[PDB]
Amino acid sequence: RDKLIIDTDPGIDDSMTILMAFRAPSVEIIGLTTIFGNVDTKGATRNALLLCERAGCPEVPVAEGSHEPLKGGKPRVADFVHGSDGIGNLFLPAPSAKKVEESAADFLINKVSEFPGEVSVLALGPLTNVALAIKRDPSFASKVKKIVVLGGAFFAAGNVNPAAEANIHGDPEAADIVFTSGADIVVVGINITTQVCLTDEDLLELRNSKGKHAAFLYEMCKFYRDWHAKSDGFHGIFLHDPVSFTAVLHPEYFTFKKGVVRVETQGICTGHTLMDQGLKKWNSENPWSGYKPISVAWTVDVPKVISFIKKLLMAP
Amino acid sequence: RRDKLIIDTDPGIDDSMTILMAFRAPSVEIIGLTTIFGNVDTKGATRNALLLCERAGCPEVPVAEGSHEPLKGGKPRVADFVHGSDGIGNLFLPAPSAKKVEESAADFLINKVSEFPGEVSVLALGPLTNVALAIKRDPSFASKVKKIVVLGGAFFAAGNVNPAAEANIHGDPEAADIVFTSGADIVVVGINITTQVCLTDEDLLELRNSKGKHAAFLYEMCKFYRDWHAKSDGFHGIFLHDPVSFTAVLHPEYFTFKKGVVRVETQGICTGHTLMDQGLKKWNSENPWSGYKPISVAWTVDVPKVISFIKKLLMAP
Ligand SMILES: [Ca+2]
Ligand SMILES: [Ca+2]
Ligand SMILES: [Cl-]
User: Fold this and answer.
1) Span from the CA of B6 to the centroid of ligand 1 (angstroms)
2) Is-catalytic flag, B236?
3) Is B275 within 8 Å of A288 when comparing Cβ atoms?
């Protein structure tokens, strides 16, 4: 039983991940921390609370995080990807369960300090709360067991624009703080997650399954699948956040390369993630020199990942 | 009937190999060499271009000296640890007798392209300063140049100066961004392509033992170049950068290309980074890749065909 905190912006695929995580027996969800991205932070908290109620676990703490990136300013949210409500325009009634008093940053510091080296963090949105925890407690990185990050585009196109992936673009300063923190980090970029999909056929199979949340998941995914058809020209959905959850439980379904990762924080390439694989000896020092390397997902065993995700989504 | 070509270059060991190859190509008419800094300071590149014209038995070919610094200014640091102090593997050859023309490389580019509209191709082997200067000074330049084939960038691959950037683009990021958005017929060959094309120690020995017109000189330059590849890349031989972009001018059928808008990062840790928008994804809103005219980016290379063509020109008697 691995202790896990999910830092998230639910979010359609975040919602699928959270419901999958509640059904996983080898995982103990000790809390959900929320962030902006797919929806404003208040909307993410509302969804996280609704998901806890839906999974039959309203006692699981939900800690609201930052309303804006580290640099400040009202974030632009992906309402064209996840709907006005962040869950595909289902416009569900409000939760009865309430968030905890403490911020997501304080919740992360407290839980990780309570069980040092035992709590893993699965980061499914912009990395603001994680960076805030790193800055407020400089021992946070060393106490966290592992940080599995869904974010970045390594030697591949971004999904916000050609340079940047959404989570990194949401807070490039926070991502750069996290990637250079010295913590045990595993980054799963969209160069990996775009290889893992659910087709229209797979979604119909989910709708017709005996899955506990099959009907709700299918309904939510309609809006998400429609964005994929309009933007990527793909008839189905990419499984971004469910793949990073698979990397927590089954890292053996992937291969990783170690390297220093830096994030561009200004100019036309704001939010671009770049890894130094260390295969070339540089003549002089550069921005990738001297930092501790992190693990970057390089390859994925697509059938094994799909099988694992499908069995959790279709579990009665 | 020969294709008019201007070579903008920083010789430079692989630049020197390309220029000698170009002088032996019968379908090509070299109408001039335009020099830039990079592998060596501009003055060193001019000295080498003049010596190469003399070596090829063509001292009448004009050499026009270009910019001594990038568009943003400052004395550039040069790759002397790659090409030697003289830019040609520390051969320290006597000075050329031939002299450079009076006009700058930028004015030479404008003049020749305006003299022969739609006929002159430009092969850019160094930082793009002179080409950007011609584009800025003459707004009709982009429409009158036949084609600009660029050796530069690293597309969805690591740079060679640092993880973000390839040397030619890093040498002048502002100039590269001006060129890539100029609207001219541009073909870019990045190191993602050229690092797939190599000459082994065995290939180099084969050149030394060949009946090649410049075999002895080429082998001598390549000794220093090979030592850098062994120290930095861990490779026993050399990558063929500039000769591959020359192969793209004469045999574009040895490659596949993808069309897309290319932008260059000019600031921060990713200064000199080249990024192309393939246009396979419909964006919700406008971004820095929106509205520009797409250019051709080399995507794949037929490595045996490119090697065979390069070897043929290097070993030609
Ligand atoms: Ca997410
Ligand atoms: Ca060159
Ligand atoms: Cl931003």
Assistant:
1) 51
2) no
3) no
Please name the residue that has the structure tokens 């949340």. Answer: A213
SS3 for B61? coil
CA distance A194 to A159: 10
Q: Residue B162 and residue A286: Cβ atoms within 8 Å?
A: yes
Taking CA atoms, A178 is separated from A73, A130, A249, A276, B90, in Å, by: 20, 7, 21, 16, 46
Q: Amino acid letter at A117?
A: G
Neighbours of B137 (CB within 10 A): 13
Q: Are A297 and A254 in contact (CB under 8 A)?
A: yes
Nearest CA to A1 among A157, A143, A115? A115
Longest dimension (CA), chain B: 61
Distance, CA of B83 to CA of A106 (rounded, Å): 55
What is the rounded CA–CA span in Å between residue B246 and residue B257?
15
Q: Kindly state whether B230 is in contact with chain A, defined as any CB-CB distance less than 8 angstroms.
A: no
State the catalytic residue, choosing from B170, B229, B241, B273.
Answer: B241
Q: What is the resolution of this structure in A?
A: 2.0
